[PDB]
């Protein structure tokens, strides 16, 4: 119990931990089961890709707002903008999400381009007779990748105007702290007591 000059550890092993241990021996064997499953599914489905075509989406929070990422579904506004119904789109390999909204013109355009690029490149076989087969492309993500938007001009002018970026932050932060009391100090003095006059 304690005493040399060592760091104070925190080992949580006072319950029956040995009864509930897992060792992943299956890692190597379980990989082959998934490769077999992905292969056998493609044999059943045949000429279609395994993946549904997903849209481009911006991430949340201060930490990840500077990067784009593949979302869940295309929304109802963007599916209409291209020129097709939501019920029809589900059977062509296009994911739909009824709850995502649009408050950005940049993301709205990108995904309309993504649908028009998809609709042009895919072919559709009729229900009746002839079916001219053209192999299978497995991954939809390979043919339709996700690229980061560029907001860059490598060489550019140097327009200074003696404002000071540091001084701008100190003034802007001070306004948020004091607008509460500064509104109420204006609601007295100038208003209430002087509106009575």
């Amino acid at each position: 119990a304690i005493s040399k000059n060592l760091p104070i550890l925190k080992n949580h092993f006072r319950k029956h931990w040995q009864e509930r241990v897992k060792v992943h021996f299956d890692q190597a064997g379980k990989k082959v089961s998934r490769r077999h499953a992905r292969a056998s599914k493609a044999a059943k489905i045949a000429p279609r890709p395994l993946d549904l075509l997903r849209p481009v989406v911006r991430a949340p929070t201060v930490k990840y707002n500077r990067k784009v990422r593949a979302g869940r579904g295309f929304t109802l506004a963007e599916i209409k903008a291209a020129g097709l119904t939501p019920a029809y789109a589900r059977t062509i390999g296009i994911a739909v999400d009824h709850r995502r909204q649009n408050r950005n013109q940049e993301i709205l355009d990108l995904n309309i381009q993504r649908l028009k690029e998809y609709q042009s490149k895919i072919i559709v076989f009729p229900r009746k007779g002839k079916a001219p087969e053209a192999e299978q492309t497995l991954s939809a993500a390979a043919s339709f990748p996700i690229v980061q938007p560029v907001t860059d001009s490598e060489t550019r002018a140097v327009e200074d105007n003696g404002e000071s970026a540091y001084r701008t932050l100190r003034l802007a932060r001070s306004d948020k702290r004091y607008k509460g009391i500064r509104e109420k100090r204006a609601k007295d003095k100038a208003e209430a007591e002087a509106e009575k006059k």
């Binding site: 304690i2 104070i8 140097v158 970026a165």
Partner: protein
């Protein structure tokens, strides 16, 4: 390796490196940090301090996300620009053609002063900035854009 250990070497002797008087019993002191205030005070007065007690105030539902802001010294600054475009830029940029350095794309919050950069116009983009960091950039020629 089981052969290299010292328990192989102790075969023959009685105590096996534990003494005849001390005996090596189960738990003579306690079981993990036991008697910190009573009979292991001399250990904790030395070596550790500040162990018992509680300074400060609580934060309920704290997230490692609001508190981000990874710093960047002015020593590093030019490392964000590519290696090919460097010997070109260091020798004559001279305004109307300065290399734009977006710090947030690389993954940095606050541009921060430490090193002594060369006299070339820069035009940096960053969320936050130090007071000294701005003085060094304006001495060179460039400016700082906020985001």
């Amino acid at each position: 390796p089981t052969r290299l250990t010292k328990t192989r070497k102790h075969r023959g002797h009685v105590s096996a490196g534990k003494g005849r008087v001390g005996k090596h019993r189960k738990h003579p002191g306690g079981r993990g940090m036991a008697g910190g205030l009573h009979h292991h005070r001399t250990n904790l007065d030395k070596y550790h301090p500040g162990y018992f007690g509680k300074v400060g105030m609580r934060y309920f539902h704290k997230q490692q996300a609001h508190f981000w802001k990874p710093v960047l010294n002015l020593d590093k600054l030019w490392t964000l620009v590519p290696e090919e475009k460097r010997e070109e830029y260091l020798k004559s940029a001279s305004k109307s053609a300065a290399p734009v350095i977006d710090t947030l794309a690389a993954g940095y919050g606050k541009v921060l002063g430490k090193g002594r950069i060369p006299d070339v116009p820069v035009i940096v983009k960053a969320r936050f900035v130090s007071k000294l960091a701005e003085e060094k950039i304006k001495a060179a020629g460039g400016v700082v854009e906020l985001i």
